[PDB]
Design a protein around this ligand. Structure first.
Ligand SMILES: [Mg+2]
Lengths: 49, 303, 49
């Protein structure tokens, strides 16, 4: 926290609710489908976690 | 009198290969006419296809009927007469013994003396005797001696490792000490699975398309190191690890790991699992039990 | 998930317009199995309880 980095926007309330499968699919960056996490060279498996 | 595990002593054998494949080119060229350099040898050798578990061959059907005589005396000597003089030109550049070899193979006579039998250099002849004694001792069940031969051999700076099956069956039958056949094999695969011609038939190979013998044999033989058990999720963990998709045999290895782990709803998931991999093993060139037998074991399980 | 996507693949390769009834019982057996264990894994996370 830095007195020379002021913030203009302010959160005033929070609403609780439920994520729909439509929202999720739209916002998602990648659909994950592979149980395997790494390969033999320690790189991320594509479509993995 | 046995194969030597060394690159063959050179010059004359290579220039003879020249004369041979060059004359071969001239004769077969004029032959296709009448039916109408390391690199010359290279194109020449190039344009040509390069109750028990029998990896069966390709038998006789769908092959084309016949031919009736192409080659009388007069017609052959027609094809032969000219390319032999073209050969008369560079024969004048090669050595007299080489020229004699060209004359005799071109008459059709086959040379008395092997490449080994005429070979000549101290170190290589000694390596020849070394490797020989290796192969002999391994044949003689003399795993101790043979092991000494192998270690002394691999020491030498000239030997890349064809010799690995020698050490696989060697340490295998040795049982004596040293980090064993499996360790060697998985070492072979770990060092020679990454970018990190004369000598090469299939039993030693490169990892673009199938490296065969050693890989499949450590695979099966490791599943038999589970026959020691009843390790599995290890073996199929590193059969899970590699992508070299044209296998299916590792699909049957996989489904066999699930049948062995299936020997409560967990066991159910293992049985549904093997049920899956048997069909994704119908993916490729089939390994088949009647497989209703596989399923019948799976119903003995469904009990 | 992958495993159910396979059950669903073999399930469609019925007609069974021909096709002898009982496999109906076994397909259901496999489906119940899948639903139960995914539902368990979700429960365990929200929930190991
Ligand atoms: Mg061929």
């Amino acid at each position: 926290m830095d007195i020379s980095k002021p913030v203009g926007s302010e959160i005033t309330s929070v609403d609780f609710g439920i994520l729909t499968a439509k929202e999720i699919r739209n916002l998602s960056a990648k659909q994950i489908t592979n149980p395997t996490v790494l390969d033999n060279l320690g790189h991320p498996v594509s479509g993995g976690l | 009198m046995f194969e030597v595990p060394i690159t063959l002593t050179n010059r004359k054998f290579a220039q003879r290969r020249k004369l041979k494949y060059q004359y071969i080119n001239y004769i077969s060229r004029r032959f296709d006419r009448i039916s109408k350099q390391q690199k010359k040898r290279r194109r020449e050798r190039h344009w040509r296809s390069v109750s028990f578990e029998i990896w069966r061959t390709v038998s006789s059907q769908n092959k084309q009927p016949i031919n009736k005589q192409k080659m009388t005396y007069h017609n052959f000597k027609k094809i032969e007469k000219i390319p032999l003089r073209k050969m008369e030109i560079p024969l004048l550049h090669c050595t007299k013994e080489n020229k004699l070899y060209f004359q005799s193979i071109s008459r059709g006579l086959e040379p008395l003396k092997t490449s080994t039998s005429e070979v000549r250099n101290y170190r290589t002849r000694h390596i020849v005797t070394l490797t020989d004694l290796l192969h002999l001792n391994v044949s003689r069940h003399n795993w101790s001696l043979a092991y000494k031969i192998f270690a002394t051999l691999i020491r030498i700076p000239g030997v890349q490792i064809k010799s690995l099956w020698g050490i696989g069956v060697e340490i295998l039958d040795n049982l004596s000490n040293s980090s064993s056949g499996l360790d060697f094999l998985q070492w072979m695969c770990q060092i020679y699975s990454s970018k990190s011609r004369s000598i090469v038939p299939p039993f030693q190979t490169g990892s673009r398309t199938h490296t065969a013998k050693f890989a499949i044999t450590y695979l099966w033989s490791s599943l038999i190191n589970c026959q020691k058990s009843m390790l599995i999720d290890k073996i199929s963990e590193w059969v899970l690890t590699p992508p070299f998709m044209e296998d299916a045999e590792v699909w049957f290895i996989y489904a066999s790991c699930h049948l062995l782990k299936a020997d409560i709803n967990q066991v159910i998931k293992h049985i549904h699992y093997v049920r899956t991999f048997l069909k994704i093993c119908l993916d490729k060139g089939g390994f088949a039990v009647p497989s209703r037998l596989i399923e019948n074991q799976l119903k003995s399980f469904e009990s | 998930s992958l495993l159910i996507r396979d059950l669903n693949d073999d399930l469609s390769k019925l007609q069974k317009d021909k096709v002898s009834l009982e496999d109906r019982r076994v397909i259901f057996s496999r489906l119940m199995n899948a639903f139960v264990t995914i539902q368990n894994d979700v429960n365990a996370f929200i929930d190991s309880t």
